[PDB]
Amino acid sequence: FACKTANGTAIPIGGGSANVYVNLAPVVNVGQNLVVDLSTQIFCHNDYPETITDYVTLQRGSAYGGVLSNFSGTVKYSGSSYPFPTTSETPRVVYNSRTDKPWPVALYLTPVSSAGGVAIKAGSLIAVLILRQTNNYNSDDFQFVWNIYANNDVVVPT
Template sequence: MKMKWPWLTILLLQSMTASAYECASIDWQGGNADINVNISSDVSTGKNRIVDLAPQITCKNTAGQGGWIDTMWLANDGVKLNSSIFKNLKYGVTISGTDHLAPVSETKIFDLDNGESRQLPVVLYFELTSLGEEIHIKAGDNLGSIRFVQTNNHGDRRDYTWTFFAANDADINTSTCSVLSGSTFNVNLGQIERGDIVSGGTSSQTIVKDFNIICDAAHAVDFDVKMSLVSPSWNNKAIKTSNDNLGVEMLWNGQAVSNGASQRLSVTNGSATVPLSFTPVKPASLSFEDVSTGAFTASATLILTQY
């Protein structure tokens, strides 16, 4: 591109391979390229990243002198996703923090002066506008492509396409689920009679409350449900309260739940309901008179992990 040769035919042959512009980590020095990228399975409603090129690819103007400025562009309608994988989902590209929904018009990415290098600030994304579908990606799958244009201040212009392939397997579930009671599941045990407090199981003071979850997927959605709690020293299946001699046992479908215990929850036909029961309990060695009166509080956390 910058070298002078005595014969035009030799100059044309050299221009096929020589470049003063290259991108590290993919060993790119011009022309079309196949690039392996890591895929994340984490998704949410709205925009989701497929590929973030900035941490993976850095481009550099390798000209040593002469005032060369290289400019990188996204080509007109230059973003394509593999429709056999991503189906009818909307998609686009984010350039330096600005979103461009496909089809994208020609857009400048950056300028590079002599010797300057920059991470490639390009992110491929899709939008969850068609919920309930599953996306299965295998290592080696063709994800899509980006067409770039490289120009410089000496009038050169080059077009090339980077085709992206998955470097890992990724199963992406685009459904969304929500707990009907919200992020906080409040249980009011009401007025408790000390004489009726038991040391385990259920009692006349047991409160039953349904745990409801809904999903917008047509297929079954499976969860691992884990309880995170602090237990009193005298009962490892109870939730510790602000009253030292009072705890609360929670039963999931009739089974006592301890810290770290996992349950499987499958949401079919769009919803699932699990009865939870809450029972105030005391140490078996103590009489009810040893339980202090007054208000008390307790808390625990249910962790739902979709798989």
């Protein structure tokens, strides 16, 4: 089992880290949601789908930068919603193909009432997401760590 990002980088068998740069919504109001769909960005595959089932969970989601200060969020993992920054680990999605498929996570962030001006800054770290891979074959328990960066400023009008 390995993963890749849409821009290039790969995390190989056994785990690692990688950076993911994402465009964010330029303007979001109090009462609106910023959606950050990471499933257009991170993809994974099973290296032996013919006997092995890989189980993948979102083990941890943390917020950094402006997301941490200025937003409150939920994370949607494979169609279900949990608070964000995460307070538990998610259920498991299955991987059973050798074709890369999205890791189905999206963040939903809405600005807190005190937010105004530039609420997220271009180039900055906004989240660290940990993907955890295990299987029905051995004791492998691996961490794929995704460091998420903003490509642009996000403004909360005021």
